[PDB]
Amino acid sequence: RMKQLEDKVEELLSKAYHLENEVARLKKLVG
Amino acid sequence: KQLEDKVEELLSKAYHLENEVARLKKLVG
Amino acid sequence: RMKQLEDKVEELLSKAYHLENEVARLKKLVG
Numbered sequence: 001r002m003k004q005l006e007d008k009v010e011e012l013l014s015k016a017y018h019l020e021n022e023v024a025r026l027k028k029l030v031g
Numbered sequence: 032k033q034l035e036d037k038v039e040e041l042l043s044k045a046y047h048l049e050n051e052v053a054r055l056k057k058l059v060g
Numbered sequence: 061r062m063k064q065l066e067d068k069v070e071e072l073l074s075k076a077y078h079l080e081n082e083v084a085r086l087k088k089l090v091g
Contacts, residue, residue, distance in 0.1 A: 002055065002059075002061060005052055006061075006064075008048055009048065009069055012072050013068065019034065019037060019038060019041065019079055020075070023034070034083060038076070038083050045073055045076045048069060055065075056062065056066070059061075059062050060062075
């Protein structure tokens with residue numbers, strides 16, 4: 001279970017990462 | 032709309048994970 | 061191990077609140 005939650009926080013930090021990228025692109029696009 | 036829904040999801044998955052982590056904490060100290 | 065998982069969770073939750081607030085900011089900017 002410890003490994004399960006460690007793998008889950010990494011997955012979600014990765015997702016956050018890509019979303020922050022999308023936020024930056026949206027900001028550019030909406031000018 | 033696609034970003035709204037993914038952040039909605041992230042927020043629910045992160046809150047769920049926080050609860051599980053807190054439970055695991057009780058076991059491990 | 062435990063404290064590293066807890067820290068990463070806090071990292072994540074702050075990230076997700078910031079994303080939540082950026083989404084709101086963008087919705088407004090799109091009109």
